[PDB]
Amino acid sequence: SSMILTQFGPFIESISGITDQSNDVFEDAAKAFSMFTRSDVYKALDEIPFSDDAMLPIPPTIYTKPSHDSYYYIDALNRVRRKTYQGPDDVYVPNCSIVELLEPHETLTSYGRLSEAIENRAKDGDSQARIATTYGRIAESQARQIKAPLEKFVLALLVAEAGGSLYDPVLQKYDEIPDLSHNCPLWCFREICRHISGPLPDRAPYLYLSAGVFWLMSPRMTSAIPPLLSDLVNLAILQQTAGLDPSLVKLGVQICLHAAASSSYSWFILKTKSIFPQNTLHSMYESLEGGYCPNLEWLEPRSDYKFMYMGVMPLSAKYARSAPSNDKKARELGEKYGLSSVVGELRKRTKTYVKHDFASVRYIRDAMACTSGIFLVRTPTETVLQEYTQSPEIKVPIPQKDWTGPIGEIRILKDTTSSIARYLYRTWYLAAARMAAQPRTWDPLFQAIMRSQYVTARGGSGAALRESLYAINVSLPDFKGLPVKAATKIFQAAQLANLPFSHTSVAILADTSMGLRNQVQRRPRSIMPLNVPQQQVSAPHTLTADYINYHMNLSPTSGSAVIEKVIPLGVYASSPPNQSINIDISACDASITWDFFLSVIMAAIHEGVASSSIGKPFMGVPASIVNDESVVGVRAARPISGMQNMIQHLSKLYKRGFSYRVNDSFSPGNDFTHMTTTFPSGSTATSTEHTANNSTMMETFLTVWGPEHTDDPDVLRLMKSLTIQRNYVCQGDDGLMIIDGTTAGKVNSETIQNDLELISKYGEEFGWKYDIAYDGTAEYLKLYFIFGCRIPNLSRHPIVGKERANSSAEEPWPAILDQIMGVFFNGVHDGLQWQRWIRYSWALCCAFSRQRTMIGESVGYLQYPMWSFVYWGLPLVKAFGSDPWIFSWYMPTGDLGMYSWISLIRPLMTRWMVANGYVTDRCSTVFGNADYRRCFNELKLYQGYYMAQLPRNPKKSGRAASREVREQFTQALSDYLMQNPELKSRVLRGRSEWEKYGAGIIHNPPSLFDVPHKWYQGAQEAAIATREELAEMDETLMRARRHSYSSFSKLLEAYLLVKWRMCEAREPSVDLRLPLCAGIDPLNSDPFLKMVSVGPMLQSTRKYFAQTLFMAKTVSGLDVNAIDSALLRLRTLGADKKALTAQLLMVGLQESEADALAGKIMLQDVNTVQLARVVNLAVPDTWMSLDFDSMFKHHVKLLPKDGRHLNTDIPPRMGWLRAILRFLGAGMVMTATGVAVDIYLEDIHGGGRSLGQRFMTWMRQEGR
RNA sequence: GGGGG
């Protein structure tokens, strides 16, 4: 460690709280990181005096592996395939030798790539050559699922840990996290690699590059080493930063060693991934003596997902695990995969926890951080053949006799059907009618928003559409000469803009291109990039599904994103007396087929939508005639609406199936079109659709089936007390059945077990295999809960991991920084040990802050000052002679955050600056007599500040665009959007109205007329950048670094005029013995103190924020937050109502709605959060898990502590100031380490009035 | 672009 100490000495102390941070030391540390050679990191690793406890037997078979050749074969269709041995799952990358297939690299003679000879033979068509190429390309792919070379993360860890234990400012003692000599993962990493390199001078087992992966030419290297090493590094970092129990961590290493010792690392990982969760989380408290859990009340209406904390629920034996024991299956699993030693140890330790508390949840969390974090990989061919093959077993089909004769592509489900489909059909029919009945549905704007949803910069099987169209002699415009990417639905929209639906209808049946996605702890999933006409025609399906979800059930719309996964719901559901069943449906997409679901859904919508859609087109789709054969004998023609025409065309596609075009670039010669009946993922209907069926069937079970299939009084009573509107929350195929508890305790476990078994049997009737789980735990949207405590899963957030489905190279340097910041933010949300995490993050950041640049032998270097990271959100450890660790990771981002940390030490800074020569006679309002301008330019604080705000990726705008084709394109886009003259007429009105009442007040008027331009830009910025555009990006960053400044942004200079007084610590908002988030306990002072004093966010963040906008949606391309900001700004700038009415007309509203919302906005008392947007202030993401609403309202006093001040008084017409002022106070409170404190407005330099004018100038100048 | 179903 002397190697590390010498090279990063001063920097190490700067990030350990011992010495101040300085850009000079930081940049040198950066240069040192870049000058360190890979092999040096290993040499550094050798310098570590590892303890015996950090060692464990390493399997010799991890090095000696068979040839890959017996693991593959050519199938009947000539595709290269993986040959199974351990089951139908054994389709991943096998653990084999690989050096025999490599050619030494010219220069790195010890490293090699796949023999060019072998690929050439493979390309010629040689079976053996193809097999070898496939293996080589997929093994390479497996090794690319990381963000950057492992050595960088390791070096970072060495540098960070060289600082020793950290002194907690709050607890006033050093932490007791074992040093690296006790880190088993690192030891293994060094040994495994050393053993591989053997006598070779090169210590790296492989090199992650841009030109591709290269393997160390050693007979001991295996295709399984990259994944193994990647798991070890994560575990190594986590043991030091999450303060994980070392003994547990070793268990995680053993599993990984076993995975590398097996015949397939990924496969083995997939089969054993439940070990830690099953033997801890799902086995906790078989016995229970005490502890406390939350006591929440679910407010009304439950749909708001709003809860209120009511105290603590004392625990006792009464609440011990009552759910069935998983011991047997868990042990069988361990025995089957050679891990019974691990399962047994976990089972034993889990039993020792008889109290539910911080210690016990941290144990679970720790255990669950040890699961491999690799993104499983297998060839595309394998994913497609495993996911689009299995078909649902409909044990009780809809009788053929129950369908009427056809009505085009659909058949009505006779109302005399005794089938359970009866209910599924009624729900979709009902919702279809109500949806189509809504007036908004027939508003040109609404239909523009819908037509604009799928017009995006992402793909849409562009090539297949062009050819399915060529098949009927219809050639689309090619716009020869435009600098935009052609494979975008945006390009598609422009091509189709001026063609009648009848000419593009065939495209609805065009093939579907391949799209893949790798996941952690899961298998790769195939994706279907539907084309514009396919997405268009899917509208009715999507809208009806949305209507069901918004009006008929209890569901959360989104994908996930911590807190957006409604944390509050899990706390409630998992807290005794309450209990929850974690319902999930396997093979969801493959279970939604025409045989039972789609034929019914298509029918119900087609019919229920009839009367209100009659005699009318929809979203560009015309009405038409179709053959009618409903009645027997009677055969006529039937007029249907455009909406019906859509269902008509969509039904034709759902019936036939999807032609998936598979071009497997990892498997030479594996080109085939696979037909499948599995439901599309890339469809706008997918998510909402599955959510709707989920609740609909659960409703039917609880209302009909269940009751009719049992006479058991308790079960009948239990089911009767459950409602899909009050007790069942779902999204897609995930479900959470919440059984509220009584004073008599919780509902009988045996009665619950009966209900579940019936649900299970119930789904077999229509092809659904319910994955039900009753284990005393709550699991929803990959969020884990036990006894009201959230258990972060560190396993799913691989520090070094990064999904990479395609072969394309990683984005140019700059890009990596956003990823590193994301790694930091995940740690904040996962609750790692704040100091250890912050210090490590500074090391990591520093190690990626420098890049070598080229301009033609013009070898320079791009360096980001430490200050850029602060701007991005990374808190300072110690600066300007301040105490160490005074800054919390809840410090805001950007200007708000800069304001916060600077205000907390304004005086320290001023004093430091003067005592170091930065003095002047001019007395600064913020920094007194400190020559701040000279200081900030020299320290690179201004530089870093501005560099952080520059594009971290090449720009394509400015590419020579031949004006004529450029106008044709944007015209096509315009016609697509402005199809309906009514809409256009609306915007033109807003326009001339704007010139009279709004023009001049603000300069950011959002307008539908901009969309075509924003769409063009999007298609542009989607294309591959050139090396020139790259240089241009660097030059920009480098010019900002050279330039010298005299101030911060106009908004930051304005906030700095405001001063506060931090006062009394707040009282606890929740009980301090209450486990809310594992890892967030008295051992993690700042996070814990913030959680306790500020309080947890007990409402859904989606619901909360939906109340901070006047309009929820708008045409894709415009920014809802932008529209909201313009309206409020106009109001704040004294604009007349007619001006807001004009703004609203320009974004598509009818004059009546426009005038109404405008008049409504004028007289409204706007909330803190919504109002703060007038100046671009947003609630920080890191704050989302806390009760920031309460902080703004009751703990940021705008009235000075000692009464009113002339400067602090808020002018009559400037009440909007209070919202901005609330954010600034909150900033300082949240940025200060420790307990949330009450803060009092102390001063505003030039007074409130002048502050307001200052903000009003910023407002009216945006976009000039 | 980032983090997540």
Added chain:
RNA sequence: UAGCCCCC
């Protein structure tokens, strides 16, 4: 060729 839905 590389989809859809969400927090900044």
